[PDB]
Amino acid sequence: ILDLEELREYQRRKRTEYEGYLKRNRLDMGQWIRYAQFEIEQHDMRRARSIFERALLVDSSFIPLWIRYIDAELKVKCINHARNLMNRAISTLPRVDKLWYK
RNA sequence: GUUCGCGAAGCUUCGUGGACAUUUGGUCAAUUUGAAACAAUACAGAGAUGAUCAGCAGUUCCCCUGCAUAAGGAUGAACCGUUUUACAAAGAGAUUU
Ligand SMILES: [Mg+2]
Known part of the structure; x- marks a missing residue:
């Protein structure tokens, strides 16, 4: 991987x-x-974000x-977006313990 | 042009007012540059399984033939790969305050 084009x-x-x-395996969630x-x-944050969203859409539960998505959001020191995501998750799923804890 | 009236010249001819009839066609403009495919050459080459072979499905932001909700397409096409975290609890040893 020398050049940009490459x-x-x-x-x-x-x-x-x-x-x-x-x-094929749209409903996989590991992939x-x-x-x-x-x-x-x-280091294409947009793309990654989109992918996560798509995954969520496929399997919200x-x-x-x-959690991985949240981590990703936080990893890039992009806290506000991460916060929003967390909020969304909470809204989606209250009775899961973990999101709240996170 | 048709004509139904008026006014001048010799029923014939000019000059007039009306009535009749009234807005087509184009998502397009004629050769390379607004998208056809096969074919050909070269190169490989055939689902499981050790091998040979049948058929059926399945997923898809792939289609084709087929009147087709028949049937058939290389088992019609690509799927065969990548695969490290809702991750905690206990024990032992080490450096820093
Ligand atoms: Mg066959």
């Missing part, structure tokens, strides 16, 4: 692969988090996804 090519390919894996992580690594 990176783009790599990244693009990876994204495509992820998409392919999703299209989605992996994808999100990858996006985060790539999946705490791990929520």
Whole structure:
């Protein structure tokens, strides 16, 4: 991964692969988090955010996804957004203990 | 042009007022640059399983043939890979205040 174009090519390919894996097992939720992580690594915060949102939409009742997303939000010192996300999660799911605790 | 009236010249001819009839067609403009596919060459090449082979489905932001809610398409196409956290409790040893 020397040049920018090379990176783009790599990244693009990876994204495509992820998409392919999703299209079959949309309801997986491990894959989605992996994808999100990858996006985060790539330092495209938008993309990562989108992916997480998509995952949530697929399976709202999946705490791990929520928590990982929150972590990601916090990781990038983007607290306000993270806070909002947390609030949303709480609204969605009150009787799960964990979100509140987080 | 048709004509039904008026006014001048010789029923014939000019000059007039009316009535009749009244707004088409274009999502488009004629060769490369607004998107057809097969074919061809080269290169490989055939689902499980040790091998050979049948058929059926399944997922999809892939379609094709088919009148088709028949049927058929390489098991029609891509799926075979990546896969480290709602993560705590107990015990032992070490440096810092
Ligand atoms: Mg066959």
